[PDB]
């Protein structure tokens, strides 16, 4: 048999091999392995698998994905400045007269 | 004919098939599929493909590359053992208030 | 030889080949190239390979991995009160119920 060597492909002892290069592993944790391994891709920090086996980003905290699965981003207010004082209260500012 | 089978490919019947396991999929979307399928990687969320096929990672608002390829993006009352509230912007010791 | 052109491989000249699509190249800039080339990922902006090979997010300003491998965000003034109906003032940093102090 003819390969192309210039295209991914080599002799380990006779049998056609994928010659996998950066990027590129052969799983060998299925229920067929080590005898069958599937060629997979080889990843590290800040990618995962989807149920699908599709690639995605891994997001912490602060990190979210919008609608077209793009990575995306994602202190109290001043109180009035009326000349009178406020407490704080129930998430608000609350005059101080009230409680006096 | 022998294949390796501990190296990504496998037996389809008869036919030499590569086995793709995750990360990967054959493109169903060419002119030439069903019949002549390229094999891709299998990307979902944060990622996606540049105009050159290149895999890069899908930034939305807020987030950009930097120059070199890499994914960028009231204050505290006084500290004196006293009571404080909010007045004009400022912090106003409460006894002044009573 | 018969083989799975639905399957990721074709015929170039008589031989079988690799038929690679988005996300994957040839690498030509081994020790035996470009006469043996093998199959790699192709990246771009936003990924690297670390030592090994594997594919990661690059992080630049204001982005790090925390201790699980994800993408998150790198690193005075007041936060809110308790939301308990009670009131509250500021002394040392802390909300202390007004209460106290009338």
């Given at each position: 048999v003819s390969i192309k060597k210039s295209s991914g492909l080599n002799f380990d002892n006779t049998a056609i091999?994928?010659?996998?290069?950066?990027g590129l592993e052969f799983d060998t944790n299925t229920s067929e392995s080590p005898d069958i391994n599937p060629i997979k891709t080889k990843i590290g920090s800040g990618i995962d698998y989807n149920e699908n086996g599709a690639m995605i980003t891994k997001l912490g905290a602060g990190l979210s994905f919008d609608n077209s699965g793009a990575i995306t981003i994602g202190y109290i207010p001043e109180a009035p400045r009326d000349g009178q004082a406020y407490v704080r209260k129930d998430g608000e500012w609350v005059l101080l007269s009230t409680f006096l």
């Open positions: 091999a994928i010659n996998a290069g950066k």
